[PDB]
């Protein structure tokens, strides 16, 4: 009768608090701060003398999202060059919560992204803005989430491929936009839109796998460009691009596995983006989404020691972190408690929650759903972070046409 179901609330969990060896630095001071704050969230139940249960506040989240899909206050002025991102974050959050898109909203998004599309290929952050690979990725994913004939046909595939060739560099890399610079995220953006819309030529990604491979460092993770610190956003993008390119093998997967698994925080349960930095809800996707990707990679090499039920991270603790610490009572999700909500964190907290809930490897399916059973989300594809159905459906539809040049 004295058995706590929530991993974060068990008495032995208090041992997982930071040991600072009596040597204080900014890093340890800051980590201790978060941990005090998180402990007080975990302890809330005992202190108020109530039994815990974890509820994903689906209705609050839904109203936050359905409203933002139409209209945003002057607080999102800082995202006026990222409007397709907002479409993608919001539509993906709605697809994870299993909310259909009124056919008319679908068509309004379509018409809007049409206005964002550049005549020379790709999409910009808003109507009449120059194109850029990030909003191009977001626009494509949003259109695939909608997944109607209308949506698919907004995309000008010929121009898209030209645009991608315009950004392609000698050393394997891609510019994020014309007159811009390169990082691993742009290669991922290019691989995602290229593979989904079927425009991969034999020479498009020549050198790209090796360029990405140069970004893996002494830590095992991947930095934004060669020589830079390993970081979860770039590491996710690096490995997922290589999965699309079928060059998973270009990396040392063993150092990569060891690095990402180390990024789960023993106390908080969430993931940090870099070693010795703070926990953050969005890495619930960037970091935890690496696990399904490494599973498919290592399994395809014949790793006989892989689990048939679980990803190689504490799925339970990640769910406890998101549900207890990352929900805004007004709707939306968060980096951490005391941060303010936004649509990016709403998208990636939900994306990460879904990954923590659904294991899949061959015929082996196994869910783990903390809290009430209605907490269960729709699954998401670990490479594209849209629904596995939207992915299969899109690839199938665009395989109907030839790679431009055929």
């Amino acid at each position: 009768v004295w058995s706590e179901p929530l991993y974060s609330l068990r008495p032995e969990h208090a041992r997982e608090r930071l040991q600072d060896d009596s040597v204080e630095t900014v890093t340890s001071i800051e980590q201790a701060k978060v941990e005090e704050k998180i402990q007080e969230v975990f302890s809330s139940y005992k202190f108020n003398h109530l039994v815990p249960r974890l509820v994903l506040q689906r209705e609050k989240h839904f109203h936050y999202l359905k409203r933002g899909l139409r209209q945003l206050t002057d607080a999102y002025e800082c995202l006026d060059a990222s409007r397709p991102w907002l479409c993608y974050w919001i539509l993906h959050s709605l697809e994870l919560l299993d909310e259909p898109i009124p056919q008319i909203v679908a068509t309004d998004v379509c018409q809007f992204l049409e206005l964002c599309q550049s005549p020379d290929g790709g999409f910009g952050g808003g109507p009449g803005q120059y194109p850029h690979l990030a909003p191009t990725y977001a626009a494509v994913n949003a259109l695939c989430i909608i997944g109607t004939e209308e949506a698919y046909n907004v995309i000008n595939r010929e121009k898209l491929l030209q645009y991608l060739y315009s950004l392609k560099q000698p050393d394997g890399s891609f510019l994020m936009h014309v007159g811009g610079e390169v990082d691993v995220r742009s290669a991922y953006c290019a691989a995602s839109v290229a593979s989904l819309t079927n425009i991969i030529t034999p020479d498009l990604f020549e050198g790209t796998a090796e360029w990405i491979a140069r970004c893996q460092n002494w830590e095992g993770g991947i930095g934004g460009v060669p020589g830079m610190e390993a970081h979860g956003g770039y590491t996710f993008c690096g490995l997922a691009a290589l999965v699309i390119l079928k060059k998973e093998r270009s990396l040392n997967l063993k150092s990569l596995l060891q690095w990402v698994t180390s990024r789960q925080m023993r106390f908080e349960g969430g993931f940090q983006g870099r070693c010795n930095k703070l926990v953050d809800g969005c890495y619930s996707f960037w970091q935890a989404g690496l696990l399904p990707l490494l599973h498919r990679a290592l399994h395809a090499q014949g790793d006989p020691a892989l689990s048939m039920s679980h990803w190689m991270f504490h799925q339970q603790a990640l769910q406890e972190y998101i549900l207890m610490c990352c929900q805004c009572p007004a709707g939306g999700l968060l980096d951490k408690p005391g941060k303010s909500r936004d649509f990016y964190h709403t998208c990636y907290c939900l994306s990460g929650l879904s990954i923590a809930q659904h294991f899949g490897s061959g015929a082996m399916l196994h869910d783990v759903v903390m809290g009430v059973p209605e907490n269960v989300l729709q699954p998401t594809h670990p490479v594209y972070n849209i629904g596995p159905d939207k992915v299969i459906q899109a690839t199938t539809h665009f395989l109907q046409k030839p790679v431009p040049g055929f």
Binding site: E16, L18, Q19, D20, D21, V23, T25, T27, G68, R70, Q71, L72, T73, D74, E77, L79, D80, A81, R83, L86, C87, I90, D108, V109, F112, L115, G124, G126, P127, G128, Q129, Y130, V178, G179, N217, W218, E219, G223, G224, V225, G227, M228, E229, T261, S262, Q264, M265, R266, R274, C275, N276, K277, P304, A305, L306, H310, M312, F313, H314, A317
Partner: protein, 317 residues
């Protein structure tokens, strides 16, 4: 930049007589918008007029001053940065005052990507890195882990070959915060691009340094990751004293990182056909078990799997 956006006397561009000849260009969001931002009057006014000058490709001093305001209102707008760079060149603006400008904006918005990119274009144009290491060091003084700052520093050092004083800098910062993973990465960046890690006097200095840091702060994971990082390419079992010296730390320094490093040595021992196979594998399994079960349970699924991997390939079999 003649009239500041936060001036009490700031006036909308639509109320400025020196703009009376040009008609603003409203954003076209369509008959029924999605993700429609309800901009402030100030923001919309600037961007209506920015759309007008961009549309006409007006390469004028007034346009240049306008980009400033549009950037200040949304410094992530890469379209406006591109146009500002077209103007810098068309108007043959003094790039040194433009460096003074980017310095001030980066101080204010250090985590914005576009501002750092803009600075790199100017350094490239000027072919002059003379202010960079000191500027970057000021940013890092406010946030020692700023990713863009570290990237710009790496770029500057590499492109202009300015390696000579970097290791001193790293040692300053490592002393300020020995848990700063960005600095451990910088240390590695410098050494691998200068002396390298094969010079045996250097590899030993580095390993002695790290162990010395690990001893003062045993739960600092960055040092463990460095140590592991600088020894593992060659193979941990190539260094037979290493096992012994870590086992000696265990009594009074046993973090789960020490234990996990012990396991890494054992795996390399077993992979290089060491003495006592049936055995070393067992000692490591004891350790994996202790980790999955007791010392590092957040990673239970990882440590389980290492166990299963080591079993499947190193038992009597």
């Amino acid at each position: 930049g003649f009239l500041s956006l936060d001036s009490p006397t700031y006036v909308l561009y639509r109320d400025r007589a020196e703009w009376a000849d040009i008609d603003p260009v409203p954003q076209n969001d369509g008959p029924s918008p999605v993700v429609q931002i309800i901009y402030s009057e100030k923001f919309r006014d600037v961007y209506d007029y920015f759309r007008a000058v961009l549309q006409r490709d007006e390469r004028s001093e007034r346009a240049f001053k306008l980009t400033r305001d549009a950037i200040e209102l949304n410094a992530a707008n890469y379209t406006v940065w591109h146009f500002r760079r077209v103007l810098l060149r068309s108007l043959q603006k003094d790039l040194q005052e433009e460096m003074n400008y980017i310095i001030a904006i980066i101080e204010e918005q250090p985590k914005n990507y576009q501002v750092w990119h803009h600075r790199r274009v100017l350094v490239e144009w000027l072919k002059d890195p003379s202010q960079e290491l000191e500027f970057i060091a000021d940013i890092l003084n406010q946030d020692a882990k700023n990713y863009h700052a570290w990237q710009h520093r790496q770029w500057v050092i590499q492109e202009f070959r300015l390696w000579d004083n970097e290791l001193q800098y790293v040692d300053q910062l490592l002393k300020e915060d020995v848990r700063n993973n960005s600095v451990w990465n910088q240390r590695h960046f410098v050494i691998s691009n200068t002396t390298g890690y094969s010079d045996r006097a250097v590899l030993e200095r580095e390993v002695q340094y790290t162990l010395e840091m690990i001893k003062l702060v045993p739960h600092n994971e960055s040092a463990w990751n460095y140590l592991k990082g600088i020894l593992q390419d060659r193979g941990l079992s190539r260094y037979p004293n290493l096992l012994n010296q870590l086992l000696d730390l265990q009594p009074s320094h046993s973090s789960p990182y020490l234990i996990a490093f012990l396991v890494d040595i054992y795996e390399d021992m077993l992979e290089n056909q060491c003495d006592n196979k049936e055995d070393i594998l067992n000692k490591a399994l004891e350790l994996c078990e202790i980790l999955a079960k007791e010392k590092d349970t957040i990673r239970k699924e990882y440590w389980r799997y290492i166990g299963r991997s080591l079993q499947s390939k190193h038992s009597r079999e």
